[PDB]
Each structure stands twice: as structure tokens, then as C-alpha cells.
Design goal:
Chains F, I, J, K: One of its GO terms (cellular component) is clathrin-coated vesicle membrane. With about 40 residues, chain D is mainly alpha-helical. The longest helix of chain D is centred in the middle third of the chain and has 26 residues. The radius of gyration of chain D is 20 Å and the shape is rod-shaped. The N and C termini of chain G lie far apart (about 70 Å). Classes of the chains: A alpha+beta (about 50), B mainly alpha (about 200), D mainly alpha (about 40), E mainly alpha (about 90), F mainly alpha (about 150), G mainly alpha (about 40), H mainly alpha (about 350). At the B-F interface, helix 2, helix 7, helix 8 and helix 9 of B face helix 1 and helix 2 of F.
Chain lengths: ~50, ~200, ~400, ~40, ~90, ~150, ~40, ~350, ~150, ~150, ~150, ~50
């Protein structure tokens, strides 16, 4: 609900897939929170991602 | 649909204008300015002839294309799991082009009898040229429309037969009966277009 | 009846009728020579171009196709859309034309066309080989070319079909099928003959009969054929082509009518009689016989009409070649004393690329496939059952 | 006058049809239905 | 090396075709003296006096064919040289 | 003398007579063929029977001929306006009657093929309905004759 | 002049062309594409 | 001169040809007759090699078990469906998305019941159908109140279009999940019926009876199975669909039922369900009512295929294909256990 | 002196009496046909009792035919244009009334034939609605005759 | 004698003769392009073969030009109405035939391009049907030529 | 003797060439643009590698503008109606051909820009497909140059 | 045309201002031009009444 903040960073070289071997792209993110219940909610979301 | 609404609006406006104009003119005792004789005597016979000539090939080609696509799409799609149907089901395409062949032959036949004249007023041209122009226009129109509807029906049944043949080999050889019965109406159209202009002596 | 021995030649012939040009034929035969002579190295070589593999499959196809293309380029007197005046013209002689009140007109010649007539006394005459070159420059060439090409196409198509049915007669006689010869081949060949061999013979009669002075009221064959179909005899409007046409024409109509019922009732009934003698769905046999007879009778007109593809594509090819000549290299010739060859080098390079791209490989493909279709349907279905198995040997890879 | 009537009539019909079509299309317009629109409450 | 053989073979056949066709067209102009059937193109808006101007102009036109042939032959030689770069 | 535009009306009538008949016959034949093709997968033994609808549609095409020929034979250079009106009326009547009958046969056949595919006892019933559609077309023919040879 | 002698012919021809151009435009406008992409 | 006859093929001819080609790949009755004669799963594998279901098990499955066959058959199904969908145009894409919303609802309900069984978190993933998967499928675990579920689902899954307003509560439990299921299902069915009747033509004719029967079957099931619940009769009235022919029945007779005989009396006035119920003896020695429901569904789906311009033959195809998958896996399971009690209880499709 | 072109209108009247009415009767069978496709697949025994809408459509066609024949027969050369307009009005009247009757008959027959599969008593209601649905054509015919004979 | 309205019809014929063919070829190229985009991802190796439908559509353009200059090589100030309408008829014929051929080429090209991606053997068959599509243009050209001389 | 209204028709050519021309250059320059956005998110490296369709659309706009400026530069007040007809015909041909070319380049670009992101090879194919559409535009120019000189 | 533009941009700005106040400024700037689409027109019409 917009009470938290986030920032993103990008990588160029593709990272290999250990199981199949296909190349896929990724990105890095950093979130600043204000509570632990939100940490658990975004932990569930990040388990989804 | 916006396009259908546009067409309906144009059509309704046109017919409302026609109705209102007709009623006020008839009530206004102005029937002497509606002289259809001038309308159908100023027009040159060659315009009627050439419109007929154009249509007699144009509409046939339109029907041929319609049937070509309608059967070809199904023929190509349905053969992925049965390549055997590529060559067995080529009769429909052959008929879809035979329609255009008939159209071209009719265009050649009617294209004759185009000797100019020198008269420039209705009293000098005479009845014969008027008859020639009207008859040629009518023949072109009828052959074109007949071959159009013929080609559409041929294409539809060709698609049906081609699609059904991929299930069992012993189907197509008997489902082609409707396919052959399709072409008879186009043949009739050609015959009538022949007969309508069998007594024109323009020149 | 194996159709390869005849097809191997009648296929490039029909192609060459569809593709009758000299230079393009020479290019095709040169490609054929290249591909034939280098066969050993290319065969022992890996190539990524599958198109080239299927091109290479048809070696002698392309060779014979190019040979007959060269021939038919020579016979039309077509060579890159221009005739080759080899051993003389016989049409235009202006010094002789001055006899027939032909002088001073060319002052108005700057804005008129001044038709040339036939036979002011020494004109006409047959060129011993091909089309007279003057026709290539005549502005009304299209009329005579259309007439000649349409007639040649129709005549070629009728003999192809009679060939088909006569070949079928061999197919049936070997298999010991007296019924098929007696109530099969005979009515169909008689129908084909009576309906179109008459047209062939009439075309040749008109060719060898009417001279130039009879240009007034020259009879028209197409209207006579419409009256052949519609049985209409107006008292006037078209003079008889030859005396006594009425009786022969009427008998032709009556035999054409009498052809159809012979193929419908007699042979299913004889099959029924044989089955009765044995002691067979009769209605299904009647349905099959009606299907066969109607198919043949309508395919008659449909195939004779579809043989016009020869004329159509030949005329289109001639028009396309002339169009290329008209607005690609025509600009290349001009008055510039120095820049002629320089610009013409670029222009002819472009001409070569464009005539390779369009008429060489493509119109050749269209004619190739059209002739293949004419072989598959109009020719093959009259003697070729088109059913059975194909060998599957036990050989490994 | 019999020519000016036709000329003005056809020009007027064309211009009227054009404005009608364009305004009609600009009315039935898809804003996108993004997180601003679809979302409510 | 430069102008690899892959296109140089096509270039060589093109140059041979150009040389042959241009030479033959020029010879057809000169030998037949530009018969109107085989030679429509020209540049003269006034010829009513006699044919000598027409013949001279058509010879002038046909002259350029051999220059074109020479350029095509030089192109073919250049392509052949590039083929030898192996 | 007569006006010079008399033959135009008869010409248009003769054209329309075959145009409309052809459109109706085409629609009926197309729908009957589609029905037969759809049905053929499940009941291969009924293929002959379901051809009865399509041939029915074909008959309407023939009706068109019986009008369009008859006008073209009776047309000449200087006919009067009365006969031209008569021929136009006959042609339009038969053409549109044939069109409507064609639509009727098409719909009825498309349904009846399915009915006989799923239920044999249906078949003969639907045959009756098809005849009724044909009746309408024939009525058109009658009117045209009374408006043609008169 | 009711309308004119000639513009009747002109209008007939141009309307006849207009119908065909509308045939062309209906199918040129209502062409369709695919969404996303096959893997 | 109507929609399906003259411009159906421009955007659908190839795909319809492919679908009707793949229809023949469905196993036939003789295939069942010879497939029920296997001795071990390897024989089943081989007899599938001999037919169109062959060359999909070339893995190193030495300890072959029926779960592997189930997984591979489902994988084949999703592959063919994704193929059919990706090559499609836009109205057909709307149709196929309308189809897949059902499995998406199924996955949503599965994860909602999984949240109650907190002990399992990741294991739900292999249990969910990949056909009904979407971008935010696994996020459903986050919610603990139905308003939070609407917040999660409003985001990018169009499933919210069926319950953005239709759910009003703030106390998720294990009893209201059935209410969520029924509300979503009835909303989806009503939207699908409205879209199908808006499309018009033969598509409406083909898809109206099927959804009608679907709504009526849902009504019958919910009426029978609502016994012994905290829900009141008016709430049972609230969940009935209005797309069937039972629209007056939904409040008139079914909404005041008290026993099974009353439901039978409701069914008695419509022959289609009356014969279905009479044939469903529900005895230990006879098939249950669910079996007759499945058989009637199969029969109507098989009927649905026969239409040359069927813009929605994909519904019948996918339902039949799921049913073949179920038949095959069930027969394999019976064969693996070395018993022949219920081998001859397979519904004979094609 | 009455003009000659006046006859044209009269001829067109006859056309309407066989065109418009016919189209109505087309619907009057066609929809009913697809209704049967849903009725007899489960309840075939009633097929013989389900032909009534088709007979009503035939009756509409009969009305159209009789009025068209009457209009065409009375036609002559020397007509006052008032007679021609009277005939045109009568023909248009009967054609459009028959169109309405055919539409109503078709829809009612379709509804009743589908509904009888679950009510054995629907026969009387179908008949008693059909009488009203068909009386429209009779009224149009009555007035058409009273106009034409006058 | 001939009014100033004459060359109107010939000039419009010349314009339309090419405009319609251009539109048809454009639609064919568009449809084939989107079909190629769909086909590419799985089977790149066929790309240089699947150009065959595209070039085919391009043919139509050239065909239009064969007439679009030709009629423009005969127009003059002193031309009668007869020749003008001859030019008009030729232009309409070629233009509409080109339009139809473009539609057909586009559709069958898309279908075959999609087909070959999963069955290379289909390739041959595709080209065969496409031959017919090209012929649709060819006939439309031919008549136009013989309408420029007579 | 020349009619006053004559110049009108030529003036409309001065509009028409541009009027449809820009429309084509609004069909493509927009649509292909969307394509180059759709994968600037993921593979921004190919942003400038498939912008060719937009440049071509600009080129068809130039094709229209050239004929427009020549048309305007060849203006007068006593123009004979024949030259007026020629001028309007040239304008119409160029305008409509340009519209079609713009359509084709636009849709092909919107497809190919998306196609290139799944495999690189498709790029080569599109460098042909797009150019084929461009050929149509060039063709229009040629006919205009024959209508402004003969 | 100006009325239409104000209507659509007003809908956009109204529903956008519900999220964050910083969309108050930018949208109104758009609105200025969306009204100038009308203003221009008035000017020329006055000239057509000046003569």
C-alpha cells in the first residue's frame, strides 16, 4: 500500500539454468520496509517470485 | 459494428430522400419534368456494352477467388495429420478456375460487335443501337452474378468435402456429387448470356 | 500403361509452346549443360540449398525444356521479343504501292496510320519459316497473333485428348475386357471426334480456302459453333462457309445427341443380365454410370475451354517480353556521343538481372506446373486409373 | 446552376460524412482500463 | 580475397553475357544498317530530305555498342582476377 | 412509332430472372452439401439419402431457365412498353420466388440431414417439409407464365 | 437543367467504382494479427 | 449470406482443420477393447506406442508407475492446448481464455483450501493444473481474509471480473470457501453464456445447450449436497444459476426442498433429467448419479463436434481429451493393482 | 385519353402478390423445420401432429396465389391509371398482411412445437393461438378481393 | 462533335486499373508477412523458401503496370467516347481481377506458411494451389489488352 | 470556349495525391513504432535495428509530395478539361497507391519487430518483405509520370 | 473537438489525482492545450465576421 520503498538494479550477461541449461535474464532488487508483518507478506510474494 | 451502422445510415438517408422528393414532386403536378425517356435515351449504348463487358469477367473472378480461398485454407490445414489429401482433393480448385475460364470466354464472345457510328442525337441513332447496348449490359450482368454465386457454392462444398475426407478414405469419391452439381448454375448463366445477345447487329 | 515414355517429350513441348522465346531458351540450355557436365563433383558434395537439390533432380527435364524452348523461339520468329529478318520480307513494297494511288499521303503521314491492303498485285506470299518479321513492327499485330495463337492452342488441345482416349483403348484391350471396348471407348471417341474434329477441319478449311479479295462477309466460325450448339439457323446474317453444310451439320448434331444414352443404359443392363445368368446393387450401378457419363460429357467442354491456357500464357509472355524491351533498354540508346556505352552497360546489367528474376525461373515455373496439370487431369484421367501400391523394398539406409 | 448544385451537394455530403465518422470514432474510444480505471474501492 | 568467388562467378557469367549480347546487337545494327524492325530507337526529328542522315545517325548510335562491350570485357577480366585471389 | 427504350425493361427482367434463381440455388446447394459432409462421419450409409435435399435445390435453377429463355426469344427491336413491363414483372416474380424457396430448402435440409443422422423415423417426415418449400417456387412460375404469354 | 445530360453518366461510373473501393477498404481495414508469440 | 458461411475460414480454417485432425487421435472403442487386455504397465506403454499416443515416454522410466503416465498425458494436453491458443486470433482468443478461466478458478479454490492446511506450502505447486496456471497463481497463499483475496486477484488476473463486487466478508474460514467457489462459478457461467449469445450465429446455437445443462447440473448437485450445513434455505436459493431452464425452479421448488424425493419431483417435469435420474439407481451394484452426469456430458460434447463452422469446437475437444486422459489413467491404475473388478466400467467415447 | 405507361403500375401489383407473400410463407415453414430437429429426437411419435404450421404456410401461399392470379387476369391495354393504382394498393396490402401472418405463424409454431415435448396438453393452446395467428391473412385477402372486384 | 467530357472515363479507367491491383498486392504481402512472423520461431530453415508466396503477390503489381502505361500510351485530346469507354472497361476488369487475386494469394500464402512449419512435405502442395491464385491476375490482364485495340 | 469549372478537377489532384499519401504514412509510422516499444523493455539493443518500416513510410510520403508539387507548379486558369482530367487521375493514383503501401509496411513492421526478438534469422527475411511493399509505392510514381506527360 | 478533449483529459486527470497529489500539476498543463484546440478556432471566426 505504498508504505514501503524499493529500488532496482540490472545485469547484462545472462545467467545459465542449472537444470536444463537454457539462458535466462534476471534482476536485483532492494526493498526498505517499515514492519515485520510486511516482511512476511513480501516473503510470501518473493516465494512466488 | 460501426461500418454496418454507417451503411445503414447512408441507405436510410438515401431512401428517405427518394421518398420525400417523389411525394412532393407528384403532388406538385410536376410530372412533366420526370421524363424517363430522356434519361434512357441520352445514355450511349457503348456505356452499357462496356459496363457489361467489364462485369462479365470481374464478378466471375471475384467468385473464383472466393471459392479458391474457402477451399484452399481447409485443404492446406487439414492435411497436416494426413498428407494423403493434398492431391486427392484438387478437383474443387480446378472448378473454381473453370468458372473464370467460362467468364473469359464469354468476355471474348460479347467483346465482338463494337463497330462505331456517327449519330449524336436520339432521333439519328435508332432503335438497333439502343437494343444492342441494353442487351450486352444485361448479358454481362447475368453471367457475372451467376458465376459469382456458382463459385461461392463450389468453394463451400469443396471445403466441406476436403475437410471430411481426412477421416476416412472412402468418403470423398461420393461427396464430390454436390461438387459436380455446383457448376450447373454457372453453365446456365453462360447459356442465358449467350442467348440474350444472339440477335444483336450493332453497326 | 506407363505414361513416362510419351510424357518425357510431350511435356517440354507444351512448355515451349507456353514459353516460346529464343534467348531465354538458350540460357536454360546453357544452365542444363553446366549442371549435366558437373554432375560428378556436385553429387559428391554437401549443399545447404534444398531448392538447388530439387532443381538438380530435373536435369534432363530442364535440358529438353530449353532445347524445345529454343526451337519454339525460332518458329515464332521471336528472339528477345524482336524478329530476325533472315532471308527476306514479302509484304511492304512502296514502289509497287505507288501504282495503287499511294503517293503524297505521307505528308499527312505525320498524323495518320495508312493501312496496307492485301493483294494490290504482288503482295501476300508465305514466309517459308515462321512469322513474317514485318508483323513484329505492325501496330495491329495483336489481332493476327491472337487469332493464330488461339487456333493453334485449340488444335493442340483436341489432338492431345484423342491421344489420351486412343491410348486408353490399349489399356482395356490388354486386360481382356470386351465390354469396356464395346460400350466404352467407342461412344466417347465418336463423341469427341464429331464434336471437335469438325472444328479442327473447319479451321483448316477456312485457312486454305478464303483469299484476300473475299474480305467482305468473311464467314465467322465461332458464331457457326454457337449455332451448332443452339440449333438456330437464321435465314441471313452469316453466309455458309461451304455448300451443303446443313445436312452434315444436322447429322453431326444428331450423332452428338445419340452418343450420350449409349453410355448410360446399355452396360449396367448387360451387367444385370450377366448377374441374372449367374444364378450387385443395380441402383448403385446406375448411379455410378450416370456419374461417369455426366462427368465425361461436361469435362468435354470444360477441358476444351481450359486448353486456352496455352494461348493465354503465350500471349502474356510475348507481351511481357515486349514490355521489357520497351522501357528498360529503349532508354539506353540515345544521341550522347560519349555516354552511350557507359550508361548502356548499367542499363543492360539491370536488364539481365530483371529478366533472370522474372521470366527465366518464374514464368518457366508457371508454365511447368500448368503443363503438369494439363498432364494430370486433361490427359491422364482418360487412361490412368491412378490407384494401387508402391514398392517398399527391404533395403537399409 | 445545374452544375453548381451537384458540385456543392457532393462536397457537402463528403465533408459531413467525414466529420461524422471521425467524431463517431473519437467517441467510442478505449482508454485502456489500466490500474487507474479497473481498480475501485 | 577481395570480391570473393561466391559472387565473382555470377559476375563473370554476367560479363560474358554482356560482352556477347552487346557485340551482337552492334553488329546487327551495322550490318543490316539499322532496319526499323530491329532498330526503332534513334534521335532525329527531321529526315524528310533523304536517308543518308538516317544511316549516319544509326551508325553513330551503333558505335556505342562496342564501347559497352569493351567495358563489359574489362569487368569480366577484373572479376576473373579477383577469382584468382585464393 | 414506339419509344426507343422499350427493350430495356425486358432486358433487365431477363437478367434478374436468372440472377436471383442462381443465388437461391447456390445457397440451397451449399447448405445441403455442408449438411451431408458434416453427417457423413458418423453414418456413412446415409450418404446417398441426404442427396435428396440438394437435388431439390437444383430444380429451382431450372425454373429460372424456363423464364429467361422465354423472354430472350420474344424480344426484338421495336416492342411496345406494355410487353416490356409484362416481361419485367414475370422475371422479377419468378426470380424472387425462387430465391425464397431456395432459402427454405437450404434451412430445412440442413436440419433434416441431422434429424435422419440421429433418428431414422425422422427422415420421411422432413421429406414432406422439403416439398412444401418447393411449392412456393412453383407458384412463382405460374404467375410469370400468365404475365409472359399474355 | 434537371441535373445535366452528362453528369448522370459520370456519377453512375464513379458510384460503381466507389462500391468496389469500399469492398477493398472493408477487407483492408478488418485484417487481424496474433498475440504474444510461440515459444 | 450470413456470418458462418462466407468469412469463417479467413481466421479459423487452418485451426479448425488441425482440431478435426486431432479428433481422430482420440482412442476408439477397439483401442479400449485391446488396451484392457494388458498384463503390466509396459504392455500399456507398447500398445500406446502402436497408436497416436506413441512416442511420448522415451525417458528412463524403469520403475514405471501410473503417476508418471498421468503426468505425461497431462503434459501432452497442455502442450496441444498452448499450441492451439498461440496461433489464434482475437475473438477465438477470448473464447479460449473463457474456457481456461474454469481451471483458473479451480486452482484458486485449491490454493484457498491449501491455506487452511498450513502444513503444506510448496507441495501445492505440483498439485495445480499447469493449464489453469497464470502469472499470479501462487500468490493466493498470501491472503487470510477474502478482501485480501480480492486485493491479490484484482491486480492482473481477470478472474476478479467475476467477484470484484460478489464477495463481501472479512473473516475467511473453512466453510465459506464453498460459497466463494459457487459465487465465482455462477458468475463465470453467466458471463460465458452472455458472451456466447452475443457472438451469435452457429456459435450461440452450439454453446447455449451445453452451458444450460452445466448450470442445471450445478443446481442439482448443490441442492443434493447442501444437506447438514449452517447455511439457510435462502442462501441456498442465492447460489442457484439462472442460465438453465430451471430459472423458475431455482426459487419455486428447489429452494424449498427438504428431502431427495422432492428433488426427484423437481426433475420429474423435465424428461432430460428425469430419465437421467431413473437410470441412476445409485445402488451398490449400479453406477452412481455422477456417472450418468459424466455420460450425458460426454454425449452432448460428442454431438457438439458436428458443425462445419463451429467457432467453439475447442470446448468439446478439450473436455473429451480430459475424459480420455481420465479413462486411460483409471484403467492403468486398475491394471497395476492386479484386480479386474471395474475394468468394464469405462465410458465408451468414440 | 388515358396514357400507356399507366399500365406499368398495375403489372407491378401482380408481382407483389406473388413475391412478398411468398417470402412470408418461407419463414412459415423454415423455422418450424429446425424446431422439429429438437422435438422428434426424443419424442418422435408426435411428428404426424406437428405438420400444422406447414399447412398454415401453404394456406398463406394459396392466398397470395389467388390474389395474384386475379390481379393479372383483369389486366388489359386501355386502363385508366386510377385502376392501376387501385390494383397496386390491393396487391401491396395482401402481400404485407401475408408477410405478417407468416412471421407470426412461424414463431408460434416453433415455440409450441418445442414446448410440447414436456406438456402433453400444449396441442389445444397451439391450435387456439394459431387460429388467431392465421386470421390476419384471411382479413387481408377479404379486403384485397373487395378492392379488386370494385 | 465529341464534347470535352470524353477523356474523363479513359483517364479514370487508367487510374483504377492500377489502384485496385496495388491494393490487392498490398493486402497479400501484409497477410503473408504476418504469416511468416508466426511461422519463423520454430523452423528458421524454411525462411528463404517461404518467400515464394510473397513474391507471388508482388506479381500482381507488375501486371497492373502492364496496362497502366499502355492505356496511357493511347490517350489524346481528340478521342471519341467509344474508345474512352473501351479503356474504362479494360481498366475496371484488370483492377478488380488483381484485387481478387491479391486476396486469394494472401490467404493461401498464410495457410501454407503456417502448414509447412509442422509438416515440410506440405510445401509442394502449397505452391500448387498458389499457381491458381496467380492465374486469377493473368486472365484479368488478358482481356484488358484486347480491349485496347478494338 | 473552355468551361470555367475545368480547372477544378486538376486542383483536386493537387489535394488528392497528398490527402491519401499522408494517410498511408500515418498507418505505418505509428504502428511499427509500437512494435519498437514492445521489446525495448527486454532487448533494447534492437531498437534501431528494425526501424526501417518508418523510414519507408516517410519515403512514400515523399512519393506523394513530389507529384503534389509538380501538380501545383503546372497550374493555370484557362486549362482545357483534358489536361485537368489527366492531372486529377495522376493525383488519385499516387494517393491511393501510397495509402496501400503505408498499410502494408505498417502491419508487416508491427509483426516483424515482434518476430525478431525470438530468433535473429527472421531479420533477413523481413528486409525482403518490407521492400516488396515499397516496390508498390515506386510503381505508382511511374504511372503518374506517364499521366503528366502523355 | 475542444469539448471532447476537455472531457477525456478531465476524466484522466480526475481519476489520476485520486492516487497521488503530484498528478495535480502535470494534468492541468495538458488541459491548457486541450482548451486551446477551441480557442484558436474562435479567433478565425471573428475575422470572418470582421469583413
Amino acid at each position: 500500500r505504498g508504505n514501503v520503498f524499493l529500488r532496482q538494479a540490472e545485469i547484462e550477461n545472462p545467467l545459465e539454468d542449472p537444470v536444463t541449461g537454457d539462458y535466462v535474464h534476471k534482476s536485483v532488487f532492494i526493498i526498505f520496509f517499515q514492519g515485520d508483518q510486511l516482511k512476511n507478506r513480501v516473503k510470501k510474494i518473493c516465494e512466488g517470485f | 459494428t460501426g461500418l454496418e451502422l454507417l451503411y445503414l445510415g447512408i441507405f436510410v438517408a438515401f431512401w428517405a430522400c427518394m421518398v420525400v422528393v417523389g411525394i412532393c414532386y407528384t403532388i406538385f403536378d410536376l410530372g412533366f419534368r420526370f421524363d424517363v425517356a430522356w434519361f434512357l435515351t441520352e445514355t450511349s449504348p457503348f456505356m452499357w456494352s462496356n459496363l457489361g463487358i467489364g462485369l462479365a469477367i470481374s464478378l466471375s473472378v471475384v467468385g473464383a477467388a472466393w471459392g479458391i480461398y474457402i477451399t484452399g485454407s481447409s485443404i492446406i490445414g487439414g492435411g497436416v495429420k494426413a498428407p494423403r489429401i493434398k492431391t486427392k482433393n484438387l478437383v474443387s480448385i480446378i472448378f473454381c478456375e473453370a468458372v473464370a475460364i467460362y467468364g473469359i470466354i464469354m468476355a471474348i464472345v460479347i467483346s465482338n460487335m463494337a463497330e462505331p457510328f456517327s449519330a449524336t442525337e436520339p432521333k439519328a441513332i435508332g432503335h438497333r443501337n439502343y437494343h444492342a447496348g441494353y442487351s450486352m449490359f444485361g448479358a454481362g450482368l447475368t453471367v457475372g452474378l451467376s458465376n459469382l454465386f456458382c463459385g461461392v457454392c463450389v468453394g463451400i462444398v469443396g471445403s466441406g468435402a476436403a475437410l471430411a475426407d481426412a477421416q476416412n478414405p472412402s468418403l470423398f469419391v461420393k461427396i464430390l456429387i454436390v461438387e459436380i452439381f455446383g457448376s450447373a448454375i454457372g453453365l446456365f448463366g453462360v447459356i442465358v448470356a449467350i442467348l440474350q445477345t444472339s440477335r444483336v447487329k450493332m453497326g | 500403361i506407363n505414361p513416362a515414355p510419351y510424357t518425357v517429350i510431350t511435356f517440354p513441348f507444351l512448355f515451349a509452346v507456353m514459353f516460346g522465346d529464343f534467348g531465354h531458351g538458350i540460357l536454360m540450355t546453357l544452365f542444363a549443360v553446366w549442371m549435366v557436365l558437373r554432375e560428378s563433383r556436385i553429387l559428391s558434395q554437401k549443399h545447404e540449398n534444398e531448392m538447388f537439390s530439387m532443381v538438380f533432380s530435373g536435369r534432363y527435364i530442364i535440358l529438353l525444356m530449353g532445347l524445345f524452348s529454343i526451337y519454339t523461339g525460332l518458329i515464332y520468329n521471336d528472339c528477345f521479343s524482336k524478329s530476325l529478318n533472315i532471308f527476306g520480307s514479302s509484304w511492304s513494297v512502296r514502289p509497287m504501292f505507288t501504282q495503287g494511288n499511294w503517293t503524297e499521303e505521307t505528308l499527312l503521314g505525320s498524323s495518320v496510320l495508312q493501312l496496307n491492303p492485301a493483294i494490290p498485285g504482288v503482295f501476300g506470299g508465305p514466309y517459308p519459316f515462321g512469322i513474317d518479321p514485318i508483323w513484329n513492327i505492325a501496330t495491329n499485330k495483336l489481332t493476327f497473333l491472337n487469332s493464330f495463337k488461339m487456333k493453334m492452342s485449340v488444335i493442340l488441345g483436341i489432338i492431345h485428348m484423342l491421344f489420351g482416349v486412343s491410348l486408353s483403348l490399349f489399356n482395356h484391350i490388354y486386360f481382356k475386357k470386351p465390354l469396356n471396348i464395346y460400350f466404352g471407348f467407342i461412344p466417347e471417341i465418336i463423341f469427341m471426334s464429331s464434336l471437335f474434329g469438325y472444328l479442327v477441319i473447319l479451321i483448316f478449311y477456312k485457312w486454305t480456302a478464303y483469299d484476300a479479295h473475299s474480305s467482305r462477309n468473311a464467314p465467322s466460325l465461332l458464331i457457326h459453333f454457337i449455332n451448332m450448339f443452339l440449333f438456330s439457323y437464321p435465314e441471313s446474317g452469316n453466309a455458309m462457309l461451304y455448300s451443303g453444310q446443313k445436312g452434315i451439320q444436322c447429322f453431326l448434331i444428331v450423332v452428338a445427341m445419340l452418343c450420350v444414352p449409349w453410355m448410360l443404359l446399355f452396360k449396367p443392363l448387360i451387367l444385370r443380365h450377366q448377374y441374372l445368368r449367374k444364378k450387385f446393387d443395380f441402383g448403385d450401378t446406375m448411379v455410378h454410370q450416370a456419374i461417369h457419363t455426366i462427368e465425361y460429357c461436361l469435362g468435354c467442354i470444360s477441358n476444351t475451354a481450359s486448353y486456352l491456357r496455352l494461348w493465354a500464357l503465350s500471349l502474356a509472355h510475348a507481351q511481357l517480353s515486349e514490355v521489357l524491351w520497351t522501357m528498360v533498354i529503349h532508354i539506353g540508346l540515345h544521341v550522347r556521343s560519349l555516354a552511350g556505352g557507359l550508361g548502356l552497360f548499367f542499363i543492360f546489367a539491370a536488364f539481365a538481372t530483371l529478366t533472370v528474376a522474372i521470366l527465366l525461373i518464374m514464368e518457366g515455373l508457371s508454365a511447368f506446373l500448368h503443363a503438369l496439370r494439363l498432364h494430370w487431369v486433361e490427359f491422364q484421367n482418360k487412361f490412368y486409373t491412378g490407384t494401387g501400391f508402391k514398392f517398399l523394398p527391404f533395403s537399409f539406409e | 446552376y445545374s452544375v453548381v448544385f451537384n458540385l456543392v451537394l457532393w462536397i457537402m455530403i463528403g465533408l459531413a460524412l467525414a466529420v461524422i465518422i471521425t467524431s463517431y470514432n473519437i467517441w467510442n474510444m478505449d482508454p485502456g482500463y489500466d490500474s487507474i480505471i479497473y481498480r475501485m474501492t | 580475397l577481395c570480391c570473393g568467388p561466391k559472387l565473382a562467378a555470377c559476375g563473370i557469367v554476367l560479363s560474358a553475357w554482356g560482352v556477347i549480347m552487346l557485340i551482337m546487337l552492334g553488329i546487327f545494327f551495322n550490318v543490316h544498317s539499322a532496319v526499323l524492325i530491329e532498330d526503332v530507337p534513334f534521335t532525329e526529328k527531321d529526315f524528310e530530305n533523304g536517308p543518308q542522315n538516317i544511316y549516319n545517325l544509326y551508325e553513330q548510335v551503333s558505335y556505342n555498342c562496342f564501347i559497352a562491350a569493351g567495358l563489359y570485357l574489362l569487368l569480366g577480366g577484373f572479376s576473373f582476377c579477383q577469382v584468382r585471389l585464393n | 412509332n414506339n419509344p426507343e427504350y422499350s427493350s430495356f425493361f425486358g432486358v433487365m427482367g431477363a437478367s434478374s430472372a436468372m440472377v436471383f434463381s442462381a443465388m437461391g440455388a447456390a445457397y440451397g446447394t451449399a447448405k445441403s452439401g455442408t449438411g451431408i459432409a458434416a453427417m457423413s462421419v458418423m453414418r456413412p450409409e446415409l450418404i446417398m439419402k441426404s442427396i435428396i435435399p440438394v437435388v431439390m435445390a437444383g430444380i429451382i435453377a431450372i425454373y429460372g431457365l424456363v423464364v429467361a429463355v422465354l423472354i430472350a426469344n420474344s424480344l426484338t427491336d421495336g416492342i411496345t412498353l406494355y410487353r416490356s413491363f409484362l416481361q419485367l414483372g414475370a422475371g422479377l416474380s419468378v426470380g424472387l420466388s425462387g430465391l425464397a424457396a431456395g432459402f427454405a430448402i437450404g434451412i430445412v435440409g440442413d436440419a433434416g440431414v441431422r434429424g435422419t443422422a440421429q433418428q431414422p423415423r425422422l427422415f420421411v417426415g422432413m421429406i414432406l417439409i422439403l416439398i412444401f418449400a418447393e411449392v412456393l417456387g412453383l407458384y412463382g412460375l405460374i404467375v410469370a407464365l400468365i404475365l409472359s404469354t399474355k | 437543367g434537371f441535373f445535366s445530360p452528362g453528369i448522370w453518366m459520370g456519377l453512375l461510373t464513379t458510384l460503381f467504382m466507389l462500391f468496389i473501393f469500399t469492398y477493398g477498404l472493408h477487407m483492408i481495414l478488418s485484417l487481424k494479427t496474433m498475440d504474444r508469440f510461440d515459444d | 449470406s450470413f456470418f458462418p458461411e462466407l468469412y469463417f475460414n479467413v481466421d479459423n480454417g487452418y485451426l479448425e482443420g488441425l482440431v478435426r485432425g486431432l479428433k481422430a487421435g482420440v482412442l476408439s472403442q477397439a483401442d479400449y477393447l485391446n488396451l484392457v487386455q494388458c498384463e503390466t504397465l509396459e504392455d500399456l506403454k507398447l500398445h500406446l506406442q502402436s497408436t497416436d499416443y506413441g512416442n511420448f515416454l522415451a525417458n528412463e522410466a524403469s520403475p514405471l508407475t501410473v503417476s508418471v503416465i498421468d503426468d505425461k498425458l497431462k503434459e501432452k494436453m497442455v502442450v496441444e492446448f498452448r499450441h492451439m491458443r498461440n496461433h489464434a486470433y482475437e475473438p477465438l482468443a477470448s473464447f479460449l481464455d473463457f474456457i481456461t478461466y474454469s481451471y483458473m478458478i479451480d486452482n484458486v479454490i485449491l490454493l484457498i483450501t491449501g491455506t487452511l492446511h498450513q502444513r503444506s506450502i510448496a507441495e501445492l505447486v505440483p498439485k495445480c493444473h499447469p493449464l489453469g496456471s497464470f502469472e499470479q497463481m501462487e500468490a493466493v497463499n498470501i491472503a487470510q481474509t477474502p478482501a485480501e483475496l480480492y486485493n491479490a486477484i484484482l491486480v492482473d488476473t481477470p478472474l476478479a471480473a467475476f467477484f470484484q463486487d460478489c464477495i463481501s466478508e472479512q473473516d475467511l474460514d473453512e466453510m465459506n470457501i464453498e460459497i466463494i467457489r459457487n459465487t465465482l462459478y455462477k458468475a463465470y457461467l453467466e458471463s460465458f453464456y452472455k458472451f456466447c449469445t452475443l457472438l451469435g450465429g452457429t456459435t450461440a446455437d452450439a454453446m447455449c445447450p451445453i452451458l444450460e445443462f452445466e448450470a442445471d447440473r450445478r443446481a442439482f448437485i448443490i441442492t443434493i449436497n447442501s444437506f447438514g450445513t449452517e447455511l439457510s434455505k435462502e442462501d441456498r436459493a442465492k447460489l442457484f444459476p439462472h442460465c438453465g431452464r430451471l430459472y423458475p425452479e431455482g426459487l419455486a421448488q428447489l429452494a424449498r426442498a427438504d428431502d431427495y424425493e422432492q428433488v426427484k419431483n423437481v426433475a420429474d417435469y423435465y424428461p432430460e433429467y428425469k430419465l437421467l435420474f431413473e437410470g441412476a439407481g445409485s445402488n451398490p451394484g449400479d453406477k452412481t448419479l455422477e456417472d450418468r452426469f459424466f455420460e450425458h456430458e460426454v454425449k452432448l460434447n460428442k454431438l457438439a463436434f458436428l458443425n462445419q463452422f463451429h467457432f467453439g469446437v475447442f470446448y468439446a475437444f478439450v473436455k473429451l481429451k480430459e475424459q480420455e486422459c481420465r479413462n486411460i489413467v483409471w484403467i492403468a491404475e486398475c491394471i497395476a493393482q492386479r484386480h479386474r473388478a471395474k475394468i468394464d466400467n469405462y465410458i465408451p467415447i468414440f
